[PDB]
Design a protein around this ligand. Structure first.
Ligand SMILES: CC(C)(C#Cc1ccc(-c2ccc(Cl)c3c(NS(C)(=O)=O)nn(CC(F)(F)F)c23)c([C@H](Cc2cc(F)cc(F)c2)NC(=O)Cn2nc(C(F)(F)F)c3c2C(F)(F)[C@@H]2C[C@H]32)n1)S(C)(=O)=O
Ligand SMILES: CC(C)(C#Cc1ccc(-c2ccc(Cl)c3c(NS(C)(=O)=O)nn(CC(F)(F)F)c23)c([C@H](Cc2cc(F)cc(F)c2)NC(=O)Cn2nc(C(F)(F)F)c3c2C(F)(F)[C@@H]2C[C@H]32)n1)S(C)(=O)=O
Ligand SMILES: CC(C)(C#Cc1ccc(-c2ccc(Cl)c3c(NS(C)(=O)=O)nn(CC(F)(F)F)c23)c([C@H](Cc2cc(F)cc(F)c2)NC(=O)Cn2nc(C(F)(F)F)c3c2C(F)(F)[C@@H]2C[C@H]32)n1)S(C)(=O)=O
Ligand SMILES: CC(C)(C#Cc1ccc(-c2ccc(Cl)c3c(NS(C)(=O)=O)nn(CC(F)(F)F)c23)c([C@H](Cc2cc(F)cc(F)c2)NC(=O)Cn2nc(C(F)(F)F)c3c2C(F)(F)[C@@H]2C[C@H]32)n1)S(C)(=O)=O
Ligand SMILES: CC(C)(C#Cc1ccc(-c2ccc(Cl)c3c(NS(C)(=O)=O)nn(CC(F)(F)F)c23)c([C@H](Cc2cc(F)cc(F)c2)NC(=O)Cn2nc(C(F)(F)F)c3c2C(F)(F)[C@@H]2C[C@H]32)n1)S(C)(=O)=O
Ligand SMILES: CC(C)(C#Cc1ccc(-c2ccc(Cl)c3c(NS(C)(=O)=O)nn(CC(F)(F)F)c23)c([C@H](Cc2cc(F)cc(F)c2)NC(=O)Cn2nc(C(F)(F)F)c3c2C(F)(F)[C@@H]2C[C@H]32)n1)S(C)(=O)=O
Ligand SMILES: [Cl-]
Ligand SMILES: [Cl-]
Ligand SMILES: [Cl-]
Ligand SMILES: [Cl-]
Ligand SMILES: [Cl-]
Ligand SMILES: [Cl-]
Ligand SMILES: [Cl-]
Ligand SMILES: [Cl-]
Ligand SMILES: [Cl-]
Ligand SMILES: [Cl-]
Ligand SMILES: [Cl-]
Ligand SMILES: [Cl-]
Ligand SMILES: [Cl-]
Ligand SMILES: [Cl-]
Ligand SMILES: [Cl-]
Ligand SMILES: [Cl-]
Ligand SMILES: [Cl-]
Ligand SMILES: [Cl-]
Ligand SMILES: [Cl-]
Ligand SMILES: [Cl-]
Ligand SMILES: [Cl-]
Ligand SMILES: [Cl-]
Ligand SMILES: [Cl-]
Ligand SMILES: [Cl-]
Lengths: 210, 210, 210, 210, 210, 210
């Protein structure tokens, strides 16, 4: 990644074994649960495009999702090229060529060029642009691998309301609400929630059905 | 987080895999026991609003509590806006716009803006303001998930006083005392504690009933 | 904690996940064995009052002892106030108000004030003052949870002297010696230790009874 | 490796136990799966030829592949010598002799010489040149140890399409595509994929056969 | 410990949780095997007397040995006082009082005084003086807990010579050689070692009896 | 070890618990397999003679090999003294006495002297000289503990060629080749390898017999 040294200069740093290992492990354990997106964004803090490609490549398995991820990256890269056409001309001394979509995705660009963009003044955050494309593609993967629709999350007749709400917002998060939460509650809690009226907080709802 | 480098300047640092992993693990193991609040405050030392949102998002499960947490944040953000209305005008060079509630909660603000507020002179500690809102909301979650009332913590007839006091203050902490501690002691220890008189220390009480 | 950077200035540092985790684990494993006091002092090296309160709060369980710890802190804080009454007056620019007992214990003081005291010239080591109160209170807890009196540590008739001495000084340490060590030895070793005479070293005693 | 200190100078650093251990472990667990190449490139970030040889030597087992790796290195080194013949002459003060293939592969060069090349201005990245040769040789090993041909990856009659696509691109990656993916789908999904037409995305294909 | 910062000044550092934990673990696992002495010396690199006392205090159990260790320290401290009598007089500004035995052992000295001695020019290495006393006392403990005499290490009639030599020098190290190694070899290997003659290396001896 | 600080000065560093622990563990797990030599060289990067002796002393067990290691060190030290006789004379201010063999092996030299040699300009790398002697002695240990001769590595009649080549070069490495690899192949693969002709690569040989 590109970190600021303790003197105030942005320099390149090798990705640490701890960072590499945490990413690999979170995919093995959590696959494409929603909370894998924040881990990816946090672990790739300050990442160059090379670091991002490293992290994606260390994933073994899930190659169907990884391939869908490439197609999303190609979609976003092609959109970047339609909005930012590279102008012909010799690059001035101490300056950087404009990045293409494939340069941001690290396929036609070197690490030294990525460092040049990211440490430019003003910087071209090719790492953050690429990370956004990846998180976009990861969100579609999370959505596709969501097993259950919110319409099928219904409170059991003897299911504690807390457990039901846990399953409800867990499902909702992956599908990516208030009145449906009441409608899918069991008869005994729905009656209590009816009498609470509208505008009740979740805490008030949970307190009323416990 | 925003740390001070070893030269004396406040700079941004990537959240470390150790910090991310410790937070995730403490929620898996301890859920919403009271001691999860100090871990959250310590792990988010110097955190930006983005880091705080990262930590909350890495939580898988407990989505009922996580949703109640958002409602508390929205309550606190809306109160921040009623007390701090943003004034219209162009921001002066080298200065920061006033933060709204949603900027403090990281929903309408960028990392660069959060760094600008937090490293301003004087700084606007949007991270500490947001952390306070979260700890406020976490405390209500801890209180709601407290299973047992202090009125039901009674010493067993052959229960060692030490074990009873352990359960008593554990329950008290989650519910968030002296005379009730005597009243709920078993007959044999209550008689001893009566004769100790008032103003006895816990150490004196424990010594008298062991 | 307040560490000295590699340039020679005392600056504040976030408590590390390693430090937090080690303290929690040592309490889970060792409870209030005597060797938990050195771990606490070493782990809270350079700690502010906030860090000390963090560490104590991360403890789950043992709330009877934790409450006795507060009473010892209140005793010591009140003694600090009787010896150091805060004088009325406006604090001069660049100076710190005198700390009260509750400021040292972090209940009425902010982190910024604690940093001001601890990095003052000369510094007011509110962290070390608070740590002393805590270690004082922890010692009383260790003493109270000591199960066995030294009078009941007697060498078994076929117990190796080494094992006996191990149990003896282990018990002695928690209770917090030479002639009692002989008196509680078994008949066969006591006869040997009699003939050694007084002023023998432990190594001489152990060698004589092995 | 050769890292840039926090002041801006490229200096040599001892390879860390974490880096050494991660490489050894990834070979024990993953052998020569494709994702072992990115781990090798990431763990040897900034590596000198000595560090690269260290990492390869810490591998126990797989000595058949390790020997094939040497033959690839010798092939590449000999090609380097045919393209870069070392010119005779005394090396000027403060300058470095031109590297031979065997100097890049660390067999006829010292660490001090490798540091001289890598920290030269402009630098001769003997580490990156050597790493490229190794990754080249590792790719041939991954290809040779690929057990299954893409022609044998066929969807089972009741196999979920997602699982099939996972096996397909996993196999494809090791062998190192769209129309073959349809042809090897089972009859029921092939009929659906026929009607989708050409130019469908993988996400559209997966959605249509789930 | 007292480390040199990356600028060239000797400053105090908190003992790290890793250092504390490694020492505790090595005592639990290896007790007083000989190789515990090098671990102690390496883990207490640069240690102050306070750090040394911390490490010894974190040991739970083995209190018989720990008490023998104090008696050795008192012996060495008293010898230090007989060779270095403290002269009466006011200490000059910026200078340190001469250390007594009990100051070196950290019982009558503060951390600030230990830092003053250790960072003086020339420094008084009270940490290294104390560490020497401890290693002296630890060596006597290792010697006392050595279970077997070298006279009882005899090669079994079908015991491989390598295994025998392993047990021999292991025992010798704890007891703290060549001709006895031959004498205790079994008849078949002794005959071979006789014919080798004197002045044979261990490698020659092992090769001859394998 | 002697590391270069982030400012460009060679200073001494305490050996880290991670380094100590990794060395101990690799000996417990791998004993004297060949790949233990690279781990030793990597873990002792920049090591002083004291650090090297520390690492060797932390080894418990294998004392037969450890003693053979001392004899190799004494051989090499005595050769160093025959090639570098120390000249009599007072050492000039700011200079270092010439090292003897026993000074390089850390037996008659202090840490401060080792730092003086290693940080001299030009430096006397007593650490690297000592490490070379140790690696020399470790290689003889690896060779002696090699169980199987290369003449006994023969491909089984139904053994996959890959597995055979794995055992072959593993054995060869410890014994420390092409035509013997063919001669020891089973009849079916030998016939194929005959027809390949000479000058075939290992990859061609493996491909032909799979
Ligand atoms: C990936 C990344 C770059 C980012 C970001 C990112 C940025 C901003 C915000 C956010 C912050 C505060 C508030 Cl009050 C709201 C809000 N208040 S509201 C009422 O909607 O108006 N909304 N937001 C999202 C915003 F900004 F997009 F609007 C927020 C979040 C929250 C952070 C958060 C997580 C948490 F657990 C508990 C919290 F209190 C806050 N994360 C989510 O909310 C995810 N989530 N989704 C849903 C669902 F879909 F089911 F409803 C559900 C959640 C849930 F909260 F977990 C919970 C079960 C409900 N994250 S990062 C930093 O992680 O690496
Ligand atoms: C989250 C965060 C930002 C913070 C803070 C924070 C700030 C200040 C203080 C504190 C410090 C010293 C004293 Cl003497 C008192 C006091 N003395 S008193 C008699 O009340 O007048 N009170 N306080 C709270 C104050 F300041 F709010 F008043 C304190 C605490 C204590 C720290 C502490 C924990 C501990 F274990 C043992 C200690 F000796 C001190 N924590 C609590 O006390 C929590 N607790 N709650 C209750 C209950 F409700 F059951 F009674 C019980 C506890 C308990 F102690 F654990 C024990 C069973 C009893 N924490 S952080 C730094 O953790 O990240
Ligand atoms: C908490 C903290 C801030 C502190 C400190 C602290 C400060 C000083 C000293 C100390 C140092 C050297 C000597 Cl020679 C003596 C001494 N010599 S003597 C003969 O008494 O006159 N006394 N002391 C205590 C002093 F200074 F208070 F006097 C010491 C200790 C010792 C350190 C130590 C531990 C150890 F294991 C072995 C050692 F060789 C030295 N620790 C204790 O002795 C604890 N202990 N208690 C008893 C008992 F009660 F049973 F007798 C027993 C021990 C025991 F040694 F473990 C052993 C079974 C016997 N610690 S910290 C740095 O840990 O974080
Ligand atoms: C070793 C090292 C130095 C390097 C590099 C390196 C350099 C660039 C790129 C890359 C980046 C973005 C795009 Cl969009 C494409 C592209 N888009 S495309 C449609 O082809 O035109 N192609 N590339 C390769 C390029 F550049 F060579 F063209 C890329 C990769 C990708 C990174 C990546 C991995 C991932 F998992 C998911 C992603 F979204 C992106 N890695 C691979 O693709 C490996 N892979 N191989 C195949 C197969 F063969 F089966 F098809 C398959 C993959 C797969 F993606 F995993 C997935 C199942 C399919 N890595 S490092 C940095 O790791 O240490
Ligand atoms: C604690 C500390 C501060 C220190 C130090 C310290 C200082 C110097 C030396 C040393 C170095 C090189 C040589 Cl050649 C000799 C030597 N050559 S010789 C022939 O005697 O003349 N002698 N020495 C000791 C010296 F200097 F004191 F003379 C040495 C050692 C050796 C280091 C070593 C360990 C090892 F495993 C293998 C090695 F090749 C070298 N350690 C020991 O030898 C311990 N040991 N003891 C005996 C026994 F008693 F059985 F014989 C046995 C050993 C043994 F080697 F393990 C092996 C089975 C035999 N350590 S530290 C740095 O560890 O933290
Ligand atoms: C200890 C230390 C200081 C050092 C060093 C050190 C220094 C240089 C080299 C080296 C580098 C590149 C090439 Cl191409 C050759 C070469 N090409 S060749 C055809 O012979 O002419 N030779 N060398 C040794 C040189 F330089 F001495 F010649 C090399 C090695 C190789 C590194 C390596 C390991 C590996 F696994 C795979 C590689 F591609 C390269 N290590 C070895 O080869 C060890 N080995 N031994 C044998 C055997 F004996 F069976 F044949 C076998 C190996 C084996 F490769 F593992 C494999 C099964 C065969 N290490 S360190 C840095 O580790 O800490
Ligand atoms: Cl790491
Ligand atoms: Cl790349
Ligand atoms: Cl794969
Ligand atoms: Cl509830
Ligand atoms: Cl980390
Ligand atoms: Cl954010
Ligand atoms: Cl979830
Ligand atoms: Cl009690
Ligand atoms: Cl940490
Ligand atoms: Cl506080
Ligand atoms: Cl609790
Ligand atoms: Cl004994
Ligand atoms: Cl490390
Ligand atoms: Cl090399
Ligand atoms: Cl091997
Ligand atoms: Cl799907
Ligand atoms: Cl640590
Ligand atoms: Cl001390
Ligand atoms: Cl104890
Ligand atoms: Cl042998
Ligand atoms: Cl470490
Ligand atoms: Cl030494
Ligand atoms: Cl041993
Ligand atoms: Cl093969």
């Amino acid at each position: 990644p590109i970190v600021q040294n303790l003197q105030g200069q942005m320099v390149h740093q090798c990705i640490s074994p701890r960072t590499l290992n945490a990413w690999v492990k979170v995919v093995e354990e959590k696959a494409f649960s929603p909370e894998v997106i924040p881990m990816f964004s946090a672990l790739s803090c300050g990442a160059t495009p090379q670091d991002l490609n490293t992290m994606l490549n260390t994933v073994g398995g899930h190659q169907a999702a990884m391939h869908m991820l490439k197609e999303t990256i190609d979609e976003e890269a092609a959109e970047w090229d339609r909005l930012h056409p590279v102008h012909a001309g010799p690059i001035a001394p101490g300056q950087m060529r404009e990045p293409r979509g494939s340069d941001i995705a690290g396929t036609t660009s070197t690490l030294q060029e990525q460092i040049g963009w990211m440490t430019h003044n003003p910087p071209i955050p090719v790492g953050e642009i690429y990370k956004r494309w990846i998180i976009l593609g990861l969100n579609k993967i999370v959505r596709m691998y969501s097993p259950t629709s919110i319409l099928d999350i219904r409170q059991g007749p003897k299911e504690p309301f807390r457990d039901y709400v846990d399953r409800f917002y867990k499902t909702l998060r992956a599908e990516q609400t208030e009145t449906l939460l009441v409608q899918n509650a069991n008869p005994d809690c729905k009656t209590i929630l009816k009498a609470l009226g509208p505008g009740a907080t979740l805490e008030e709802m949970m307190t009323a059905c416990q």
